[PDB]
Amino acid sequence: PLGSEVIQALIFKDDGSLGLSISGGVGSSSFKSGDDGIFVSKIAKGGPCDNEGTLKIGDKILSVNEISFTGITHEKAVEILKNDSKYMVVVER
């Protein structure tokens, strides 16, 4: 209805995890049609990402702590998200 929305969310880790599972990436099978990118493919109920409440499944991750996630691999995104306790994630919905 509003088109692509740039949403922002600050999530704090718990038990070395952010509570979200990602899919996609450059060199990977696309999560959506002809769109490489890191997508929130799952949200663990009761986890940090769920308890914050801003992110939703299907969002393309655009940035994580000002690290551009556009044009990166799936393995690079996993390597980044598994570093710090605070995560400022910017997504497009």
């Binding site: 995890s17 952010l18 979200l20 599972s21 990602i22 899919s23 060199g27 990977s28 099978s29 493919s41 799952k42 663990a44 799936h74 995104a77 996993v78 998200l81 598994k82």
Partner: peptide, 8 residues
């Protein structure tokens, strides 16, 4: 192409 879903 690989289609991975990684828990983070």
């Amino acid at each position: 192409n690989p289609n991975p879903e990684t828990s983070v």
